[PDB]
Amino acid sequence: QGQAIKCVVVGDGAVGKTCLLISYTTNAFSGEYIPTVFDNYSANVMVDGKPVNLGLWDTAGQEDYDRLRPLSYPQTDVFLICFSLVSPASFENVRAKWYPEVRHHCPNTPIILVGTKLDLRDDKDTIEKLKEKKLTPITYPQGLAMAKEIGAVKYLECSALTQRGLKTVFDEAIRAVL
């Protein structure tokens, strides 16, 4: 058996919460966007000698669930607050929406700030798409700054598609607890 660890995942509609978990636990990725209502995944992981039943709770980013979402929060060992490195709108909500909601229900429980979609921050298609609307993809130093600002215990960037940065997200989610 292994040590139970409840990891809860929050952030804007479409940032890649779900994809990030599917990609970690099954190495699978979909182009398709099927919005989460609520889901639950598991992963027996081996980190630094010790073994762990990582529980992972995938929450709906959509505001409709603002009322129902914090039912997930009691007894959480660590949170992942997720933002797309490619939607600065999803970025500001980290201190606007996601850090207040979490600390409101769980004021002590560690946070790991997660910049998702790392594979698109260098994409011409996507840099150009934003250029139009006065926009900048979120850089590492800016992400790091946001993390410091919310007392995130780590800042970590990833892509569920390439899987660049992927395993370190969960390795560190487990590390915020042990």
Ligand SMILES: Nc1nc2c(ncn2[C@@H]2O[C@H](COP(=O)(O)OP(=O)(O)NP(=O)(O)O)[C@@H](O)[C@H]2O)c(=O)[nH]1
């Ligand atoms: N290029 C790229 N696209 C990604 C990545 N992760 C997710 N996406 C895409 O982003 C969209 C949203 O993914 P999804 O995981 O469903 O987001 P979510 O935040 O879980 N959704 P919700 O909050 O509504 O449940 C999909 O088109 C998905 O394929 C990534 O690492 N790279």
Ligand SMILES: [Mg+2]
């Ligand atoms: Mg989801």
